[PDB]
């Protein structure tokens, strides 16, 4: 806990992998909110 300014604490990214970013977005899905709807399945509908 004593103030140490001599270490690089952002060392987690040395372990990240190819699918990391999308896996975390999958885990974040439950926390979202109902998206808004235009009223049509697509502009081509």
């Amino acid at each position: 806990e004593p103030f140490d300014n001599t270490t690089y604490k952002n060392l987690q990214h040395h372990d990240y992998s190819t699918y990391t970013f999308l896996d975390l977005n999958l885990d974040l899905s439950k926390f979202r909110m109902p998206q808004p709807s235009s009223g049509r399945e697509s502009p081509r509908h």
Partner: protein
Amino acid sequence: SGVNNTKKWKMEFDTRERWENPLMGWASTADPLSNLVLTFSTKEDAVAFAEKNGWSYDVEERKVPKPKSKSYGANFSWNKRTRVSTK
């Protein structure tokens, strides 16, 4: 897309026979009024000229482009089909 050749009325005459010259195959005609095209500022002026010269005429009215609604924003509509998929 230019529109400067649509500003004035014209008078033309009916097309008649053109045939191939036996010697060289050129286009031969016996119609003296083949290339006769007259220019007028108004339909009334043209009709008057035809009448005094004793020609039968058919008048076709001017087709003007209709005014339109142009919106660059509609290309990015939120709920409409005007949304473009490519710029």
